[PDB]
Symmetry: C3
Subunit: 144 residues, 3 copies
């Protein structure tokens, strides 16, 4: 029954201000991704669901440097509307590796799109397949 | 089959010492809440389960200021007894936004009550819609 | 009929370099564990899945002290191969209580073994019941 996706970070570091259009993480390896339910659009990094349902959504992003903000943040967005937000305060002036995890449950319709959108700042991300990832579980049907 | 709830903050900044009673968070907005399985008590901030089951419980609290103690903390308590505990270090004297997430699975009986309880410290929290939340998934029936 | 396990930390403080073999946490307390899906090997600290299936795995580790290196990290490993990694950067000098949570979904074959592996460093962990725990949900069957 339950279909899943666990997207892993791939490629080198992402320097958010230069390397992301509007902050959407967009280099995802699709190891496990059940295609009956989940479609990754690689260019945009948007994770589309192909079926109505109850979905548990989760993400983790590893930040390793902040230039002059003391604040790394990202939103888990659904059709561009914020659903979850993760914030961490990290001192600048030194390498400070921190994984930033959030998660939660919602109802989705078919063709809705989830993304992990960084808040635009002078931030550096480590795109290691183990510290940065983005996943979901179709738990079952949505009520009605 | 699985039934779910996701409660979100709805108000401004809460000063844990002066704005809550015994640390319990209570201004929850029901975005989604299956009424056959979950009941919110808006006054006590308790989330009641109406049927036995295997429950995944999660919570995220955005702490943005601390004073006279460098240790922000909360417990996810079941019938006043701690189940999960989240702790984080944040610098005093300046506003540092930090979301503090935890989650875990347990078996519950009907009428048991879940709540998020801040540590008694001079803590300020941002009860924002996206950064402070409280939720639960009835995965299914509980063993025996 | 969902099968779950939630392991809790049992003893007092733990010094990583001195108290563990290759960083693996093994003082786990079994509360609710399905003894047809999960088997705890208390000695190695491995949680073995006895059946194929789709598993959501989670973990939380309370770090409080780090010496000489400013870096606390741990991996959730499957068959000694990394799956999830969780990092938090704290000041090397002093006490700083921090829960370090990560989680994600995967597909597992019967007899595969999960464990929490700390990085080899002078890290102090608080193995407290409510701040340090290790869990798994068999969501259902695996594809195939």
């Amino acid at each position: 029954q339950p279909a899943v996706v666990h997207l892993q970070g791939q490629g080198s570091a992402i320097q958010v201000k230069n390397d992301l259009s509007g902050g959407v993480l967009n280099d995802w390896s699709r190891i496990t991704m059940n295609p009956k339910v989940f479609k990754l659009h690689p260019r945009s990094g948007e994770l589309e669901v192909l079926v109505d349902g109850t979905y548990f959504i989760y993400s983790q992003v590893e930040v390793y440097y902040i230039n002059f903000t003391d604040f790394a943040s990202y939103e888990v967005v659904v059709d561009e509307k914020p659903f979850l937000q993760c914030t961490r305060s990290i001192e600048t002036g030194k390498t400070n590796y921190n994984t930033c995890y959030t998660a939660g449950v919602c109802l989705l319709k078919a063709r809705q799109k989830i993304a992990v959108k960084m808040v635009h700042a002078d931030i550096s991300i480590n795109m290691s397949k183990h510290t940065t990832f983005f996943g979901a579980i179709r738990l079952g049907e949505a009520p009605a």
